[PDB]
Symmetry: C2
Subunit: 96 residues, 2 copies
């Protein structure tokens, strides 16, 4: 059961509305971001910026840019703040 990223992404039509998708050990989240929605926490996560750019602010002031075609990991337990200056389609890969 392969997941067509462009497919599922084209369908979902609001920002901040994740489509969750399960596949064995892995949880996938597909969302689009614009703006920001403050701070979160949640094991490790893989964020893959399928379509625009995006950043994750950290509480201790650190900041991570995830430009298109880029992939990063947001460690477990660190309060953080995902945001997108101009809109980003994001796939997020999780465990349990």
């Amino acid at each position: 059961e392969t997941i067509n990223l462009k497919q599922h992404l084209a369908a979902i039509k609001e920002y901040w509305q994740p489509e969750i998708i399960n596949r064995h050990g892995f949880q996938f989240h597909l969302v689009k971001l614009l703006g920001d929605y403050g701070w979160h926490t949640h094991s490790d996560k893989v964020l893959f910026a399928v379509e625009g750019d995006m950043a994750v602010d950290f509480a201790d002031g650190g900041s991570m840019t995830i430009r298109e075609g880029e992939m990063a990991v947001v460690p477990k337990s660190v309060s953080h703040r995902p945001r997108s200056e101009n809109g980003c389609s994001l796939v997020l890969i999780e465990l349990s």
Copy 2:
């Protein structure tokens, strides 16, 4: 920095069943390019993402699975499978550590 530009990492690898492997916290990334096949392989689960080009995966139970440019799928641990690519595929694998 702590991010991975898929395209640029892949472009650096001009060999064929030669994974480059990157670590980032509790994740391991394999970047490898595929052409024809190398038979059956079987760990932990792996997510596969067909960064550029198409590929397929045969399984031991007879099923076979197309992963086209742009698509993800997962190969669970302890399932013998035969990864493979008709005209060549650049692919990211992902696992926990």
